């Protein structure tokens, strides 16, 4: 079967197919994904007035990200169930091309909302010291866009051309490291002149940010993290990838948003935790 | 026909099929389910300002659970009608694998929202005495997650491997008992220093919690509660399971939420009930 | 063919089929139904602040019923168009079992929201004199539930077993009469110590309640109201049943809610009609 | 082919089929339709507080009509694309009876919301002089209902029985003329004792009302406005009908609502235009 | 294969078909499109109170455009995936006429909302000096309508009749130039008597407006921008067209709306950036 520049899910699905557990788990984990985002949307809107006016733009940008993540994860949850269909004879779910091939790239282009807005929103909670708002924003948005576009191109070749996959992935990684560098500066400057309570929260936000964002390139490589014909080049790797995405999605978007809201509360004059 | 690690609904549906009453009832009871959750969402939002600011987070977390439960019960209602199709010759609804096998596991992963948030929200209404907020929260969330994940694994084997089904179910039960233990403490400490009216409501909340949460392991075992080849290993057991889920869903989420809101009103300075 | 315990719509649809007028009218009347409920939801939310705080729970419960009625009528509108498909050869719409059989029972289980909440909400507008709030509520909810459950069982046999249909219907009717009895008391006690304007509205509410609620058992019997092989055991009876439901739905839920809102305004200190 | 009492769209679609332009335009014009109504819903809600409390009911009734028109135009937009399917051999869209026949009657029953509420809402902005509120309302609602029901019956026969089509249309027209008569009185009485600004707006509202409402009987007759085998008994007439509906829908509902809101602002003590 | 007056996407799709990258990218870029508009809707509503009352109509009109753009881009995203289906034998997505032909004209009719409202909303932020509000509005709306209708007609012939395509496009362009002329005046007059900060924002708005609006005629011509049998008369041109639309949509609607909101804040007495 000719699949071309398609994600490895389609190759596993076309050859071995997916067990009940693999198929039902991947559907459920994506469903949890979009459910968390819509619940988060409600949470971020309803808690707007829990912080001083100046901090409320962070609640609004969290809500903006929730809308993006909900729409994408909802669409992708339906894409999963449309792309793989039960074969009665063998009792496994095989590629159903009438549904279209499954593509993780769907996520990447919506990151053009998520990444820029997640990086931007912290600049409405913390105060910079030596760095300029417009400068940090421009660095975040440029490197964010380049990271996403290069990775988007790469993931199309994860089976068809491992070399292109790894080269584009490496270029994307360079921009990622730049973002990590700039966010560390923002966290450091953010800690300057705020309560120890606020500083603790920013320490947690940095760890959360570092781990949650690194999970995305982890998901990128997932099928090959056990090498050629490894344990993960299987339905187990398919499950692992969507699980990692969902953990990353909840952590990078919702928990990040909640911690920023808690920081905003400590920095708020009237409010306290 | 090879169904593998699938719920017993698919076996009944593939062999005997479902009568009009069994099929139509299961569809209607799931439809009532998601209708209650969306109505509950509206109720919890519209009554936010009926309690003092400090208590409003409980309304918000109720709303969060309503969103999760609505999305899941809506999706599962469609899953039911897609998985079983009318056979004109015999006049019963049989497994339609083109719709996918039906899986109750869909519910379990969304409990990673419901369970943590339901257990958390009471800590925004009652005041603890001897117990520490962070400690109760961490115990609820850890044991909640472990209870859900172990049960999720178990239910895949409810037909294919009764031993795995019962062992995973037993491990899950251990974590459940821990949750019951911690919640009893929270209720007791919550009663200390509040009006007799508030204490009565917490007594009711404990009974509701105990019964409603115990229904879930009841739903887990449903097909085997009348032993091998029992009355319940049938379309009658299929009906019973979804009925028990719906009673549990309405009770554990909505009625629990309403009682907590009523408690918040008694604890509120301005409000009287 | 073998339809078993199915509503008469499926028998007419399987034997005679439906004319363009019968099929298109039934679809349109259900569409009007769900449109009225969603419009009503908007109305009840937007007019919350038109009455004193104490009366606003009635607006909220109206909104809750609108959500239930919208979801059900929307789902049932789609169920109608899925269950009957055009036959080009004869130019009529015949039963399409791939869509499932059509079941009015879908409505009944959602009444477990509508009936309890419609009966409850008046107790937030009128003041009782001799009767106790908790007692009236408990009688409404018990008899409401029993009325619904017994009728739900009955309607499955409306073709397959006329005896069961009529016996279950009669038992259901007994609980209905109890509800009528209790509501009459509530209306009388509500009239005590309020303006003549408020008393006139409660008189209207009683007439509306009596007629609108009686339409439901009317819909139950519809196919047999012209006896065996009567005018109504036909596509004309199918049209009549859904028309009666829609009139009953609009009257019992929306107009009832509007009149209660108008009563709340007269009873409100600041507000005036 | 046997189509029975069906609209002429189905006859054109079954015999000639629709060109790319005819099919794509009819889909797009209905899509614009429902888009305008949902945008209008947002506008009428967001501008509620731009007028004195007493006038806000008019914003609410505008919103109610937006919900009705959105739901109907959305459903009808999907009905269009389901009822006509591309034939590769000839390159035109032909009747696809599996989707159901297309029926304009779908619109008519939703007018039982639109007509009564559009006629009602002006009575919350203007003050009557010689006429009684309840009397004008009752005349509007009775004649409105009769106009709709008689026309609804008529449109089923627009091909199958031209005589019935014209007779029912004529009866409907009589009730329409009554509505025009009553609305002219309302406008005249509304002009009495208000600013020149308010009087100008009521003059505009009358012209808008007269033209926009007359478009509906225009749409009714559309296929025959160029006589037997005329230019309009074609895909061009199909396009014209839905175009006229969309112009009528936007004019009679949204622009009417906006002008009433502007009138409310001029009549408002605090507010200025 | 006879496609008639259809867009070039259908010809490429019917002859060469689309690679995984071409098909998946076009789906993702449209998905990003509608996601941005729904996120924008939330943003424009939530930031209404960030500007003085007089400026809030601009937030409302932004929201109005978001609803239109969301609905259209969502519908068009589904139209893309319905119109092209995977062929297992060659591994490309080919025209699936059962889904309907793909038409960009769908966008054009919704511009009857977007264009008039985008041009209107600036007149609620800037103050005119020489020019009259009603006059600028009328010129914008007339030329906007004529630009859209002439272009709408043109795009049907982009393959079937290049002459009609170019002539209608040229006529449309004339009206576009008129709009550019009037908007330049509005921006110049808007700069008069406001802070240098506000003037800088209007300079940005003019560049954004000029580039973003010019992208639409760019999308119109896209397939022929590399001449006959050029690089762009291919799946690469199909990708380019939808990419350009999405850049234009985000830029002309959301970024334009955000900049107007920022201008409104600078012009607001209480508020500051
Ligand atoms: C191929 C391997 C790629 C190598 C990895 C590259 C990582 C660093 C990239 C860019 C550094 C700075 C780029 C800045 C982009 C312009 C935004 C900006 O800095 O302007 C702010 C303005 O001055 C208002 O203060
Ligand atoms: C600019 C980056 C382009 C990299 C393309 C690439 O690495 O291609 C590998 C080659 O095709 C392996 O056969
Ligand atoms: C955050 C929670 C995620 C939980 C989800 C679990 C998914 C497991 C993912 C990665 C583990 C694999 C790490 C790779 C270490 C194995 C290295 C190896 O096996 O060798 C490579 C091979 O030999 C060279 O050819
Ligand atoms: C089958 C069971 C039906 C569940 C009933 C309603 C579901 C919708 C949730 C709305 C809950 C309303 C409860 C209520 O009205 O309580 C008032 C309170 O006591 C004063 O604050
Ligand atoms: C709620 C879940 C509660 C689980 C209930 C009992 C657990 C018993 C402990 C597990 C012991 C295994 C029993 C077993 O394996 O018996 C099945 C046998 O193989 C038949 O064929
Ligand atoms: C706390 C973390 C749980 C750790 C280990 C539990 C492992 C439980 C696995 C039990 C499997 C039982 C089984 O596989 O049954 C044997 C055989 O198949 C009968 O037919
Ligand atoms: C077969 C024929 C059936 C006839 C049933 C007729 C009426 C049912 C009346 C039963 C009402 C009792 C309900 C229990 C109740 O609501 O108790 C009162 C409340 O608790 C005080 O506070
Ligand atoms: C739970 C209530 C159980 C309800 C019991 C169902 C009664 C079924 C019935 O009345 O049917 C009679 C006859 O078998 C029809 O032909
Ligand atoms: C709360 C009250 C519960 C009591 C229910 C008993 C009534 C059940 C009535 C069932 C009727 C059975 C029947 O009519 O059977 C007919 C027979 O099968 C040939 O016609
Ligand atoms: C609303 C509902 C109100 C219905 C009340 C009417 C009669 C109740 C008395 C029970 C009637 C039992 C008689 C059974 C019967 O009539 O059977 C006919 C025939 O033998 C089978 O096809
Ligand atoms: C809007 C509808 C406006 C209707 C106006 C038609 C006037 C009279 C119809 C009388 C029926 C005449 C039928 C004779 C022609 C025929 O039946 O052929
Ligand atoms: C291509 C991807 C680009 C899509 C990004 C826009 C995200 C959509 C809405 C958020 C509204 C914009 C929020 C900007 C805040 C500006 C401000 O706060 O000043
Ligand atoms: C054919 C080519 C025509 C292109 C002409 C461009 C300007 C068009 C209209 C200006 C109207 C001025 C304002 C109209 C208000 C009514
Ligand atoms: C200002 C409003 C313009 C109104 C009418 C102009 C109509 C003229 C546009 C029609 C052009 C038709 C055409 O170009 O046809 C070419 C021919 O078909 C090649 O073979
Ligand atoms: C936005 C609308 C642009 C309208 C006209 C631009 C066209 C002007 C260029 C002249 C077109 C003549 C032409 O390109 O001739 C076709 C030839 O076959 C190819 O080589
Ligand atoms: C909620 C969305 C978020 C936080 C998105 C984050 C995305 C990344 C950190 C992506 C990084 C990548 C690399 C570093 C290399 C491979 C390609 C990417 C784009 C997955
Ligand atoms: C609204 C969601 C709620 C309250 C979820 C509750 C879930 C449980 C109490 C689950 C318990 C289980 C066991 C104790 C054993 C079998 C497996 C479970 C997970 C069903
Ligand atoms: C909006 C929902 C409402 C008001 C529901 C009302 C339902 C009833 C009054 C049902 C009554 C019935 C009988 C008295 C006999 C036959 C069975 C029932 C349930 C239809
Ligand atoms: C937004 C909905 C509106 C304003 C509906 C208006 C409907 C009419 C004015 C209908 C009139 C008709 C006639 C006068 C004759 C033919 C049948 C009708 C119902 C189309
Ligand atoms: C968000 C919607 C916007 C900004 C729409 C803008 C539309 C145009 C500027 C269209 C211009 C065209 C021409 C100048 C020639 C070809 C036809 C058109 C309509 C695409
Ligand atoms: C369905 C069987 C389970 C019901 C359990 C009832 C709750 C008892 C705990 C106290
Ligand atoms: C308090 C408000 C009172 C409202 C009274 C106004 C009456 C409007 C109700 C309309 C009912 C029309 C019934 C038509 C009967 C069907 C006949 C159709 C002819 C074939
Ligand atoms: C300054 C005004 C010019 C703006 C640039 C618009 C470019 C439109 C061309 C479309 C892009 C073609 C990509 C192949
Ligand atoms: C940095 C992590 C990337 C390590 C590269 C591992 C090389 C994977 O090797 C690939 O494995 C596939 C599935 O097992 C095989 O089908 C391919 O033939 C093979 O190229
Ligand atoms: C706590 C309740 C669990 C007790 C275990 C019950 C044993 C059920 O045993 C199983 O029953 C199935 C259906 O009856 C049969 O098809 C299986 O062959 C049998 O293993
Ligand atoms: C109180 C109202 C109940 C009246 C019961 C009427 C009995 C109807 O009798 C039924 O009529 C059907 C329709 O033709 C027939 O098909 C059935 O064979 C017949 O039993
Ligand atoms: C405008 C109100 C009067 C219209 C009456 C016009 C008579 C139309 O006449 C009809 O035209 C159809 C289409 O050409 C034909 O198919 C029918 O045979 C014919 O009866
Ligand atoms: C301003 C830009 C207008 C340039 C129009 C000239 C291009 C028209 O060239 C067209 O190319 C198509 C494929 O490329 C062919 O199928 C057509 O037959 C041919 O007319
Ligand atoms: Na599937
Ligand atoms: Na089904
Ligand atoms: Na149908
Ligand atoms: Na179609
Ligand atoms: Na497709």
UniProtKB/TrEMBL annotation, chains A, B, C, D, E:
Keywords associated with the record: Membrane, Transmembrane, Transmembrane helix
Localisation per UniProt entry: Membrane
Topology versus the membrane: Multi-pass membrane protein
UniProt KW ATP-binding keyword: no
SMART domains noted in UniProt: Bac_rhodopsin
Pfam families for the chain: Bac_rhodopsin (PF01036)
Principal subcellular localisation of the protein: membrane
TM region(s), chain numbering: 25-46, 58-77, 108-128, 140-157, 163-183, 204-223, 243-265
GO cellular component terms, semicolon-separated: membrane
Residue ranges the record marks as coiled coil: none
Family: Belongs to the archaeal/bacterial/fungal opsin family.
Record protein name field: Sodium pumping rhodopsin
Organism: Dokdonia eikasta
């Amino acid at each position: 079967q000719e699949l071309g520049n398609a994600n490895f899910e389609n190759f596993i699905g076309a050859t071995e197919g997916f067990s009940e557990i693999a198929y039902q788990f991947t559907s459920a984990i994506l469903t949890l994904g979009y459910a968390v985002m819509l619940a988060g949307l409600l949470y971020f809107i309803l808690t707007i007035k829990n912080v001083d006016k100046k901090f409320q733009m962070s609640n609004i940008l969290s809500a903006v990200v929730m809308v993006s993540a909900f729409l994408l994860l909802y669409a992708q949850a339906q894409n999963w169930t449309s792309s793989f269909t039960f074969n009665e004879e063998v009792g496994r779910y095989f590629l159903d091309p009438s549904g279209d091939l499954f593509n993780n790239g769907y996520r990447y282009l919506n990151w053009l909302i998520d990444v820029p807005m997640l990086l931007f929103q912290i600049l409405f909670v913390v105060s910079l010291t030596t760095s300029k708002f417009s400068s940090v924003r421009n660095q975040f948005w440029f490197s964010g866009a380049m990271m996403i576009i290069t990775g988007y191109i790469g993931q199309f070749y994860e089976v068809s051309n491992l070399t292109a996959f790894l080269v584009w992935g490496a270029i994307s990684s360079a921009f990622f490291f730049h973002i990590l560098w700039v966010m560390k500066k923002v966290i450091n400057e953010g800690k300057e002149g705020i309560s120890p309570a606020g500083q603790k929260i920013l320490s947690n936000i940095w760890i959360l940010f570092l781990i949650s964002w690194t999970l995305y390139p982890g998901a990128y490589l997932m099928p090959y993290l056990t090498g050629v014909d490894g344990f993960l080049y299987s339905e187990d790797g398919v499950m692992a990838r969507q699980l990692v995405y969902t953990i990353a999605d909840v952590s990078s978007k919702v928990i990040y948003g909640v911690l920023l809201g808690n920081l905003a509360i400590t920095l708020s004059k009237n409010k306290e935790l």
